[PDB]
């Protein structure tokens, strides 16, 4: 498959061999802080799919962090429901999400985890729910995020147009919402923001116009 949802882990050497000489220096600037790269399909779902894999993959090496991620994720369904969401509409998305967490809990191989992220139904069900988490948090904290959204739309209308639908690529408002909703810190490199500010980043991403990839230290 020339266009997989989540690729294999690679070395960033394939960033030169994809490119423009002004760009050639900044990879060396990146090679001194990052050793490896994992790619997601540029479909407007890159951020959520990149985050989802990076964190779940990391939780294989931290049982105690997995338990609180599992606890937050389990409560999140009824949490969305209480704030206006239909349980029956989001049910199966949440269950697929919890299912991946259980696989990590039972120490699934990294290879098997990658396969699940390459199953269209499973991988997209995941992104759907991550978008619902993001949207749920945004509407919940509508007073805060209203300041950052231009007049003409409520936070809800913004969510139903920019966050909830698939194919809608993420920006800084998506990242902070998801990072706060799941309580995990995210750092984005471009081609260094920490979400939330003044925290220790557990997820490292690379951003190119309308696209996110996974970085590994």
């Amino acid at each position: 498959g020339s266009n997989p949802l989540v690729s294999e882990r690679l070395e960033l050497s394939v960033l030169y061999k994809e490119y423009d000489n002004i760009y050639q220096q900044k990879i060396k600037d990146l090679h001194k802080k990052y050793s490896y790269i994992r790619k997601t399909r540029p479909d407007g779902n890159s951020f959520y799919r990149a985050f989802g894999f990076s964190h779940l993959e990391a939780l294989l090496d931290d049982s105690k962090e997995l338990q609180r991620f599992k606890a937050v994720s389990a409560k999140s369904k009824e949490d969305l429901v209480s704030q206006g969401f239909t349980e029956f509409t989001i049910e199966d998305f949440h269950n697929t999400f919890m299912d991946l967490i259980e696989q990590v809990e039972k120490q699934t191989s990294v290879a098997d985890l990658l396969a699940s992220f390459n199953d269209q139904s499973t991988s997209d069900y995941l992104v759907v729910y991550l978008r619902l988490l993001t949207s749920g948090y945004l509407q919940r904290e509508s007073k805060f995020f209203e300041h950052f959204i231009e007049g003409g739309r409520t936070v809800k209308e913004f969510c139903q147009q920019e966050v909830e639908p698939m194919c809608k690529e993420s920006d800084h408002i998506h990242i902070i919402a998801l990072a706060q909703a799941l309580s995990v810190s995210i750092q984005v490199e471009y081609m260094p923001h920490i979400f939330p500010e003044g925290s220790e980043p557990k997820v490292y991403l690379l951003y190119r116009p309308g696209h996110y990839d996974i970085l590994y230290k």
């Binding site: 209203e146 300041h147 950052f148 959204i149 231009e150 007049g151 920006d171 800084h172 408002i173 990242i175 902070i176 471009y190 923001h193 920490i194 979400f195 939330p196 500010e197 003044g198 116009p209």
Partner: protein
């Protein structure tokens, strides 16, 4: 710099600026740049959910001391 305002980013960071009541918006963006290293052409400033325009002053938007501007980056 005659009065004090605060600029808020999506990460949760609060930036303190010293400004003149008649400062243009791009002069505010300039102060943000030589303090956050962010090119003014990337900065989008909001006050009361309305985008502030280059050429207009803080007083044009009734922005007084200790006010909050909100910063969203374009890319």
């Amino acid at each position: 710099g005659s009065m004090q305002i605060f600029v808020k980013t999506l990460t949760g960071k609060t930036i303190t600026l010293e400004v003149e009541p008649s400062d243009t918006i791009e002069n505010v963006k300039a102060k943000i740049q030589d303090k956050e290293g962010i090119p003014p052409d990337q900065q989008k400033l909001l006050f009361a959910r309305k985008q502030l325009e280059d050429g207009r002053t803080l007083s044009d938007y009734n922005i007084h001391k200790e006010s909050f501007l909100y910063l969203v980056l374009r890319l």
